Amino acid sequence: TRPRFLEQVKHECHFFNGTERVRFLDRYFYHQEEYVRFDSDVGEYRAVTELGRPDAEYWNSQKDLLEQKRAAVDTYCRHNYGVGESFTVQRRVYPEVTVYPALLVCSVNGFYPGSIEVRWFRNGQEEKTGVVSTGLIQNGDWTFQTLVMLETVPRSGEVYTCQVEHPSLTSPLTVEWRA
């Protein structure tokens, strides 16, 4: 029952087009409320709320740490990006695609990164209507999954194809299911 008090700190590096445009943010929070932050595009600490006022003024008076934060985009952001690039930015895990009835379901699992494209085809033609997706689901272990269902109006001998496009592949991945 004892009331809780939480302090959170988030040092973020945002990358646009590789490392050409980098934005650094030094954020502080009391519970879930951000009270002070340093922004690369500003060059100083600004109080987000009155509780941060004393900090923004005191920290900005210290020319030693402002120098440090103003160089963060290079010494911290770009440096770390280079160190982790091979296993984060360039991580490629191909997906596993499964097609099963009961309405047709196309399950795409264990892929990374999240950018993917799943399409349903009926006799060589792409299906637009009767297609529902669950969206991108994170498993928490650096893999994603997604299910794309197709409302099916049965027929004799027609073939259904689930086509998947993903960065880890050379060409689209396919799975054909015939009744």
């Binding site: 008090f5 939480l6 959170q8 700190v9 990358f15 519970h31 009270y35 596993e96 099963y100 994170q138």
Partner: protein, 177 residues
Amino acid sequence: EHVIIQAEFYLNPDQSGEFMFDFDGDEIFHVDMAKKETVWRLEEFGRFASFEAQGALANIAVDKANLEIMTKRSNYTPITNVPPEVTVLTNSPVELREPNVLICFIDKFTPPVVNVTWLRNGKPVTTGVSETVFLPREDHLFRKFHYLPFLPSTEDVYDCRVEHWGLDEPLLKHWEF
């Protein structure tokens, strides 16, 4: 495109903290403050990079210091409990006798404290379980994953039991084949 976040937090009166690196929503690693070592989310990450775990403690000590100060400035205003929404799903499509993983996803909640228990046919399961630490969200609440490897069977039923001060009573998310 991409975001790399070094996330930290200290909690009173539990006197516990966390220090982790996040890449586009996934944990690269977190620091075990008692063993003073770097715990990579995936083993292989350790073969490509390194991190001086002890450095994390310096940041955590400073975090507690700021907390002490903010606790007073705010006139001892405590945190407001936000109950988590729980989802239970599987790692891949289910097929009898084929290894799979049950995922209990706990989302949108604070403070970062939860009791998660897996139940098979109403009874506690602790063997083979693993979990992630608290992951940060953009709204500054938290996420957390708990796993249970299992062999799909028609005679077993599972429940993910979550306890959180934002809930009047334990929440139970059920799953069955």
